[PDB]
Amino acid sequence: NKTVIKILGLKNSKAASNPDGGLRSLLDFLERKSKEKITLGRGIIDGDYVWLKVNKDDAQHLLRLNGFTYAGATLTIEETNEPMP
Amino acid sequence: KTVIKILGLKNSKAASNPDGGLRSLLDFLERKSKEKITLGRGIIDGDYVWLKVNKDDAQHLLRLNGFTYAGATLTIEETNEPMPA
């Protein structure tokens, strides 16, 4: 089944000044870093978080990337049963 | 010494505990291993539980990978990641 992932720290990063807030570049970075071949299509920014809806296997791959540094900011990745905003 | 990462406590019923269910989890791990293991240093960081243990202890903990605790599937893994302060 599907799962919701929250990513924190993009706003604090250097990528934040981008037109889209650095959203796509973040998702692109996550795809490269996992090396499991994760595919991130749609993501959104609500509040300080970046929200992703993914399958169970994908969720584990993202959680592995927790604590990595992106654009000069530490990424915090969390699984949640919260409804997608 | 070895570092162990545990995932799935947040999804469990013990998550609502005062200490996040850390103590109940470690208590469960000690009993389930049947080695009469003593778990010294542990912490909750993000969705993960971190444990610092000797090598033989790690093997018994690793056997419990995939087991269900408090209604949540546990993913137990060894890592060379530094333990967070």
Residue numbers in the entry:
A (entry chain B): 97 to 181
B (entry chain A): 98 to 182
Text of the article:
The Mex67–Mtr2 complex (NXF1–NXT1 in metazoans and small bristles in Drosophila melanogastor) is the principal mRNA-export factor in Sacccharomyces cerevisiae. Mtr2 is a ∼15–20 kDa protein that also has an NTF2-like fold and forms a tight heterodimeric complex with the Mex67 NTF2L domain.
Like other NXF family members, ctMex67RRM did not contain a typical RRM consensus sequence that is based on two motifs: RNP1, (K/R)o-G-(F/Y)o-(G/A)i-Fo-Vi-Xo-(F/Y)i, and RNP2, (L/I)i-(Y/F)o-(V/I)i-(G/N)o-(G/N)o-(L/M)i, where the subscript ‘o’ or ‘i’ signifies whether the side chain is surface-exposed or facing the core of the RRM fold. In ctMex67RRM the RNP1 (residues 143–150) and RNP2 (residues 101–106) sequences were G-Do-Yo-Vi-Wo-Li-Ko-Vi and Ii-Ko-Ii-Lo-G-Li, respectively. The RNP2 motif appeared to be more conserved than RNP1, although the characteristic aromatic group at position 2 that typically forms ring-stacking interactions with RNA was instead lysine in ctMex67RRM. The UBA domain showed the greatest conservation (29% sequence identity over 55 residues), whereas the RRM domain had the lowest (15% identity over 73 residues). Classically, binding of the RNA cargo has been attributed to the RRM and LRR domains because together these domains are sufficient for Homo sapiens NXF1 to bind the viral RNA CTE (constitutive transport element) sequence motif.
